Design a protein around this ligand. Structure first.
Ligand SMILES: [K+]
Ligand SMILES: [K+]
Ligand SMILES: [K+]
Ligand SMILES: [K+]
Ligand SMILES: [Mg+2]
Ligand SMILES: [Mg+2]
Ligand SMILES: [Mg+2]
Ligand SMILES: [Mg+2]
Ligand SMILES: [Mg+2]
Ligand SMILES: [Mg+2]
Ligand SMILES: [Mg+2]
Ligand SMILES: [Mg+2]
Ligand SMILES: [Mg+2]
Ligand SMILES: [Mg+2]
Ligand SMILES: [Mg+2]
Ligand SMILES: [Mg+2]
Ligand SMILES: [Mg+2]
Ligand SMILES: [Mg+2]
Ligand SMILES: [Mg+2]
Ligand SMILES: [Mg+2]
Lengths: 200, 142, 154, 117, 69, 420
RNA sequence: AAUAAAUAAGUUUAAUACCUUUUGCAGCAUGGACCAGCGAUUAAAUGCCGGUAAUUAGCAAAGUUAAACUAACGAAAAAUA
RNA sequence: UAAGUCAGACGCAAAGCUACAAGGUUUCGCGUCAAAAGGAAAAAAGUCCGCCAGCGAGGCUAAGGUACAUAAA
RNA sequence: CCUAUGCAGCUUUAGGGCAGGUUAUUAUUCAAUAAACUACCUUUUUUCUGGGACGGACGCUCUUAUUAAAGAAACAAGAGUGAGCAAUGGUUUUUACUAAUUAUAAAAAAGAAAAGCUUAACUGCAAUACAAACAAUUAAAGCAGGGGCAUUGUCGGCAAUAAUGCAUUGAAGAAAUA
RNA sequence: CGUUCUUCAACCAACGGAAUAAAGCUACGCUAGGGAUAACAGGCUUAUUCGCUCACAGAGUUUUAUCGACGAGCGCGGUUGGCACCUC
């Protein structure tokens, strides 16, 4: 046992059992545990159902030409791309890369959590049904270079790996769900002319 | 000043119910603490070895003079104590060698293959050389 | 190859036995000789000599001679002249009715046997055959080879 | 190893010989990039600390506590995060107070799609 | 021979088949009287001198000795 | 041991003396001494660059020996894969083989139930028959014997091939051994177009003075073939073969005795030898009688007309033997293991055709199975019901009716399982 | 260690160079004042082990060199006649 | 892999030597460092939690914390 | 100060040599050989180690602590040994006996002593294992030959655990070649 | 003259034994290396050293005025030591 050579005892014992089994047949031929073994199942408990969520974003049309925007007196909170935003018309937000949309398109955001004005507030638990936010896709860009560098002193270890994140830009157009307080109504045209191209 | 003697590994090598083949060493001891039972032998230094194919057993006996005796036994495969078991053991020995060669592979050679033949003495193979090397069967009488 | 100072490789004994000189012969199996005849590369209706074996491709390069060995089951006679032979080959050929002859050649004689044209093209007489072999080789040869072999029918 | 062009691009705002001397600038460039990896990690810890301080200050002006608010939101199933709550307390005091009143007193009027079932 | 030592010998080109080499002078009919040499006894002593000996039997090369003058 | 590392078996003196020699041929010995399919594959893989046609011929022949060792089961996966690889070398060297080498190649591949591709098989046949068989003269008796049986097993039925082969071999028939002639006779019987040719008559005449040299297995096959080939016994072989069987009735193995006995019964030459025939069967029934031979014994005894006797209930034991083979039950007794009883080889699925034939024969025996608590035919049908239950997919309308007729004949028609 | 991450631009927080050598170095252990140029497993023969091909190789030009191969136990019977 | 390595260190737990001393020395069981960034204890190789592919102003926790410094009763 | 594939100079009754002089022996009309004295040339003068030197030690067994598997180190501790026996080996019979070893709870179908006969303290081989870096070291069923005591069992030295030394070189007996 | 078998011997006790054999001085010294290793200083340890407390035996002889002990515990880093952690 003092030696560090690996032991061959398991090999010597297996050769002995294999020789006996090959030449001498067994007496038993059945095993009850195998006979009554049941069908394989996925689990022993009912599955847990999932909680529904409103749609994240969906295209509804395109923008025809140059437009202008004016300031309004309402705001809301919307969940998008894994993070929450507080938005009001004519705001610009930056998010992760959104797939399946193009520049100069109008999208509809439905995961609205809070709506507010100067006279009333509406709180979702956790989402408000029947509210939405409209926005225009303005950019798909690569952000500034981030230089990633690693080194370990006195260990001859060095790594350099620059990268460029992918992001998307949106401009908020309209917030629907809550009326402005009395005297705060915007009584003039505000937004662009939208060509509707999404009928379900 | 220092120094130590080389270690001797005294002790048992197998337990109850373990399978053994002829010639395998079961116990290494300095004194006859354990005595040979059935289907076992004993060397001149009290080494106990198996003489058949079977499983190891341990038992205790109380003697006439009040002493305790300990035996080592080897039990046949199916508790067969008839004199016909010897031929079955001989076949098992041949089979075991075949099993080992299959597992090891062809490149673990078990026989030599030289560019010459080994001499024959008394009808068996000998490792000692003759005074002169000659080709077999390449000469005629006279 | 240095092992640190133990020098374990030189702790083994030395053997001085001299191997037999017959390890310098070219070995030809009886089973390979038959295959050539069956394919048609050798003429079995006449005496086969080492010159025919060399040209047929059975033997690659000869410096001393050819040793014939092995067992084979034959159905037709064969007459072959070689320099050495074992007992298994002799029994196999004679069982079918053949004849195996061990012929003694010298260095100059072997050249004439294999490449006779090398002498005729230069208008040189062929080498002469030997008179006899040393008595120490009694039991090794049956006849003295003739530089132009005498072919017969089989 | 960075080239001369890369080294001097990184070190254009360094002081003294660190700007135009290769040996001096190279060691200054590598040490700075090491600071940046640590800096990005710590930024996420500091900003969350600032959000909590602002929320706590707003809560205590009304007689409440930050820890009481976080527990109360989870009982109402309100999933606003700390970045949004921090901004409400600073820029939308009236909406921030409305959230506190709902959690503490639960006196909000429920809204249904069919106003008259 | 142990596997580790055997591979080194093969890697260096060891391919001997017999304990000694055959003698061409023993082949019948190929005896050359001019090239006659009495059989000698093989030497079994390795050359262990660390200055002009076998490089495989010494750890490093030692300087040579001075000539008598 | 002392020479090798732990766990490495010590050298065998018989093998060591073969490999240690002054003569060449190392690769041939290595493949000839291989003990398993995997070992032979490793030898060929490590020697690919030096393989030659002689090596390929021996490798295919070795497949016959490895199969024999692994009896009691069908061809295993490693054997099949090894055979496939060897075929590629046969195609490569198809134009370099000799007559003897081709003979060995076909025999080995035929013993493994491997069908050579028609294109390759045609090439091999062309080599043998090329030059009108003038090269067939330079072949020994064994080469000719393997040519006839090897191609016949493959199924090559080219008339020109057999015509040329028969013409060249014809003059040498009188000088072949009894076993070689018997193999030729078997091929002639299987080939219809040679039934009435002069070659068939020449073979029978040549075998007349060599009857005494036939082995028990070849002797049994020769008697079978001669009965179909020459029912008129014009050559006299049947008379001589029958005389030898009568003289040496008890000197042959059980299998050969059963085959000869069945042939005599179908020839309507039955004599009061049933008492002598019954005792060997009961003496050795658990062995030397597989399913096929068990059916042969039943047909011969039933045709001869032997009736069950109190001292020796031959039909009763045969039913137990049939049930044992169908079920495949094994025994761990030392005597059974050392005796190499056929029943301990394992389980081998049998064709439904044999099951129907056995059931019909038992029904024709005239013994009951159901009514009595312990009847001679009870164990067989009880085993039959269990076996059929696991293979219902193979039962069709005709098979069910055939068994139903047998079940009614024996006396089991109530729709209930056998008592045993 | 003279920078980094942020910012309402007022400031706030994080943060003891590199190499070599070590059980362990911000090291009060070793080397470099800075810039440009020069500066370190290369070639031949032979052997071993993988990969990719040719399907023996070189001369010569119907004939020669080099290599490789060359007996191991002739063991299968699958005929519903 | 016919490669590198044959200078090791400390914590908890045992024994020999020392003085039931040493950040001592010799063996032995587990872990960590060596070759391991991040969080807690003041700085913190070897203790406690825990193993860094990259970016983000999302969320839940471990060891440890919850009048100021300093996030949270 | 210690460590080197160390270097150099000097010293001597450390090893080897003769190549100048002296001396000895022999030979030819300034020569040849050398276990001497002087001069000169060349070579050697371990390691471990609580730094090195000084002292001590280096092979192989038994026992103690690190528990009741094995294994496990220090210039840790306590004791042996570099053999003996022609019977103190092998084997049968008897019984008022059951010890001793350097040390030790071995052993009753076993030993010791007494009485008788003997040389297996053999020739040629050997499955399988213990251990082990390797070299070697340890146990051993079984087969053939010639023997011993019994009359169908045992004997390939000794209760067991120490009494040892590779290769090379040299020597002896026999046999085969040349 | 050479080979094989049966065997033994010498120095290898520095006992895995080989370059056949085989001692010293250097403060006149020289080169390559190490804080992997000593001498001075720092560090860790506190046996020893030193101090205090308990102990109140014994001397003084009414007084624990003064002197002072066996034995135990704790502290100090200034005495003699141990280790080899920093610098060749
Ligand atoms: K400068
Ligand atoms: K010290
Ligand atoms: K030594
Ligand atoms: K110093
Ligand atoms: Mg000693
Ligand atoms: Mg250090
Ligand atoms: Mg400097
Ligand atoms: Mg070392
Ligand atoms: Mg070490
Ligand atoms: Mg330490
Ligand atoms: Mg290191
Ligand atoms: Mg939390
Ligand atoms: Mg606070
Ligand atoms: Mg030293
Ligand atoms: Mg070994
Ligand atoms: Mg006897
Ligand atoms: Mg003995
Ligand atoms: Mg110096
Ligand atoms: Mg130090
Ligand atoms: Mg230390």
């Amino acid at each position: 046992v003092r030696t560090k050579l690996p032991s061959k005892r398991p090999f010597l014992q297996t050769a002995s059992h294999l020789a006996v089994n090959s030449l001498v047949p067994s007496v038993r031929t059945n095993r009850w545990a195998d006979l009554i073994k049941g069908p394989a199942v996925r689990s022993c408990i009912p599955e847990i159902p999932e909680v529904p969520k409103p749609s994240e974003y969906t295209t509804i049309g395109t923008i025809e030409g140059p437009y202008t925007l004016n300031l309004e007196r309402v705001f809301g909170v919307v969940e998008l791309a894994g993070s929450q935003y507080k938005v009001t018309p004519d705001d610009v937000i930056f998010t992760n890369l959104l797939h399946g949309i193009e520049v100069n398109e109008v999208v509809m955001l439905e995961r609205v959590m809070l709506l507010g004005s100067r006279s009333n507030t509406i709180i979702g638990r956790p989402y408000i049904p029947g509210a939405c936010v409209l926005a225009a896709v303005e950019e798909h860009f690569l952000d500034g270079t981030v230089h990633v560098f690693k080194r370990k002193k006195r260990k001859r270890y060095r790594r350099y790996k620059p990268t460029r994140p992918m992001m998307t830009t949106l401009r908020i157009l309209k917030v629907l769900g809550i009326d402005p307080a009395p005297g705060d109504e915007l009584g003039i045209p505000s937004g662009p002319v939208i060509k509707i191209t999404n009928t379900e | 000043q220092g120094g130590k003697s080389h270690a001797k590994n005294w002790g048992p090598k197998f337990g109850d119910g373990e399978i053994v083949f002829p010639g395998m060493i079961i116990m290494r001891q300095k004194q006859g603490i354990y005595s040979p039972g059935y289907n076992v032998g004993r060397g001149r230094d009290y080494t106990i070895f198996a003489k058949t194919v079977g499983y190891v057993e341990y038992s205790k006996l109380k003697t006439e003079r009040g002493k305790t005796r300990r035996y080592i036994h080897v039990v046949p495969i199916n508790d067969d104590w008839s004199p016909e078991y010897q031929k079955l053991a001989d076949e098992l020995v041949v089979r075991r060698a075949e099993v080992k060669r299959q597992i090891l592979g062809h490149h673990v050679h078990t026989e030599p293959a030289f560019h010459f033949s080994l001499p024959q003495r008394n009808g068996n193979m000998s490792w000692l050389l003759n005074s002169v090397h000659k080709f077999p069967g390449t000469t005629t009488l006279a | 190859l240095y092992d640190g100072g133990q020098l374990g490789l030189v702790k083994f004994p030395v053997t001085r036995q001299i191997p037999s000189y017959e390890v310098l012969y070219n070995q030809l199996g009886v089973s390979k000789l038959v295959e050539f005849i069956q394919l048609g590369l050798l003429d079995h209706t006449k005496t086969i000599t080492m010159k025919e074996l060399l040209n047929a491709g059975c033997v690659s390069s000869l410096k001393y001679g050819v040793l014939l060995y092995g067992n084979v089951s034959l159905s037709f006679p064969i007459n072959i002249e070689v320099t050495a032979c074992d007992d298994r080959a002799r029994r196999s050929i004679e069982a079918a009715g053949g004849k195996v002859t061990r012929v003694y050649y010298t260095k100059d004689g072997l050249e004439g046997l294999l490449f006779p044209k090398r002498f005729t093209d230069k208008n040189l007489p062929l080498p002469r055959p030997a008179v006899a072999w040393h008595p120490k080789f009694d039991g090794k040869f049956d006849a003295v080879g003739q530089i132009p072999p005498v072919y017969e029918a089989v | 190893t960075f080239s001369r062009e890369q080294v001097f691009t990184f070190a254009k705002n360094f002081t003294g010989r660190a700007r135009n001397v290769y040996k001096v600038a190279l060691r200054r460039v590598e040490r700075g990039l090491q600071h940046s990896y640590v800096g990005r990690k710590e930024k996420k810890r500091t900003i969350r600390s600032l959000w909590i301080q602002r929320i706590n200050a707003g809560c205590r002006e009304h007689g409440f506590a930050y820890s009481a608010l976080i527990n109360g939101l989870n009982q109402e199933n309100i999933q606003l995060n700390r970045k949004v709550l921090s901004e409400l307390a600073m820029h939308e005091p009236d909406s921030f107070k409305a959230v506190l009143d709902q959690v503490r007193f639960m006196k909000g009027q429920e809204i249904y799609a069919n106003v008259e079932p | 021979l142990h596997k580790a030592y055997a591979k080194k010998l093969l890697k260096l080109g060891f391919k001997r088949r017999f304990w000694t080499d055959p003698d061409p002078q023993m082949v019948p009919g190929f005896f050359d009287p001019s090239k006659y040499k009495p059989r000698e006894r093989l030497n079994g002593k390795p050359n262990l001198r660390p200055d002009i000996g076998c490089p495989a039997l010494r750890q490093s090369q030692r300087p040579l000795k001075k000539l008598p003058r | 041991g002392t020479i090798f590392n732990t766990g490495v078996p010590g050298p065998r003196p018989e093998v060591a003396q073969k490999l240690s020699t002054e003569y060449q041929g190392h690769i041939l010995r290595m493949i000839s001494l291989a003990e398993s399919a995997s070992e032979l594959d490793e030898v060929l893989w490590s020697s690919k660059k030096h393989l030659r046609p002689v090596h390929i011929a021996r490798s295919c022949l070795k497949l016959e020996y490895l199969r024999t060792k692994e009896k009691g089961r069908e061809v295993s996966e490693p054997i099949k894969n090894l055979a496939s690889e060897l075929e590629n070398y046969v195609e490569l060297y198809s134009t370099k083989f000799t007559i003897g080498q081709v003979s060995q190649l076909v025999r080995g591949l035929s013993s493994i139930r491997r069908n050579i591709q028609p294109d390759l098989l045609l090439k091999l046949a062309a080599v043998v028959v090329a030059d009108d068989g003038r090269q067939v003269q330079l072949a020994n008796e064994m080469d000719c014997r393997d040519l006839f049986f090897g191609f016949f097993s493959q199924g090559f039925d080219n008339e020109l091939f057999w015509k040329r082969l028969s013409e060249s071999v014809l003059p040498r028939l009188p000088y072949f051994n009894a076993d070689v002639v018997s193999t030729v006779l078997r091929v002639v019987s299987g080939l219809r177009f040679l039934h009435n040719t002069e070659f068939a008559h020449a073979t029978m005449t040549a075998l007349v003075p060599k009857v005494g040299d036939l082995s028990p297995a070849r002797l049994a096959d020769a008697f079978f073939s001669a009965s179909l080939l020459d029912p008129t016994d014009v050559s006299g072989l049947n008379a001589k073969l029958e005389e030898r069987f009568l003289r040496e009735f008890t000197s042959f193995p059980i299998k050969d005795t059963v085959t000869m006995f069945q042939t005599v019964t179908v020839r309507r030459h039955s004599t009061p030898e049933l008492a002598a025939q019954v005792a060997p069967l009961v003496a050795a029934q658990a062995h030397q009688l597989p399913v096929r031979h068990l059916r042969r014994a039943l047909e011969g005894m039933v045709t001869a007309g032997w009736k069950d006797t109190a001292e020796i209930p031959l039909y009763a034991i045969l039913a137990k033997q049939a049930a044992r083979l169908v079920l495949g039950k094994q025994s761990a007794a030392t005597s059974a293991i050392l005796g190499k009883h056929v029943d301990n080889q394992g389980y081998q699925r049998t064709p439904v055709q044999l099951l129907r034939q056995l059931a019909r024969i038992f029904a024709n025996t005239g013994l009951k199975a159901g009514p009595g608590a312990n009847q001679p035919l009870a164990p067989y049908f009880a085993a039959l019901q269990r076996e059929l239950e696991g293979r219902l997919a193979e039962l069709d309308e005709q098979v069910t009716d055939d068994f139903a007729e047998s079940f009614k004949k024996v006396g089991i028609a109530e729709g209930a399982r056998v008592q045993i």
